[PDB]
Amino acid sequence: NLSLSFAGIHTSMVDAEEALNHLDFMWNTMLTQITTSRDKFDDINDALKLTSF
Amino acid sequence: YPEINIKAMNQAVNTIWLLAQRQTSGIEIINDKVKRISAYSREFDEMMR
């Protein structure tokens, strides 16, 4: 009987496995794009000529 | 626009709702696997019509 109890728990975790992987990959996409936005924005200073700005 | 046999489909929508209430797994997670599947498929037939 206890094997069936874990069987659903294992089945719940397999669906929780796939769900978090898509969740992590979107935040990893967003945390990348915020980071590469900030680091390129640190080049901004008044010495930049206006086309290069 | 080749071929769409909704006689095979609106049966298949209805049997998914039929097999939703019918199933006797005796477990608590398939019981909300099928309920989420079947409530989509019924609403899928409604929203198509």
């Binding site: 719940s12 669906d15 929780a16 796939e18 769900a19 898509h22 969740l23 | 989420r36």
Partner: peptide
């Protein structure tokens, strides 16, 4: 989107 509404249910299940 990638993270669908069925994904977030499966976690909350």
């Amino acid at each position: 989107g990638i993270f669908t509404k069925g994904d977030l249910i499966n976690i909350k299940l």
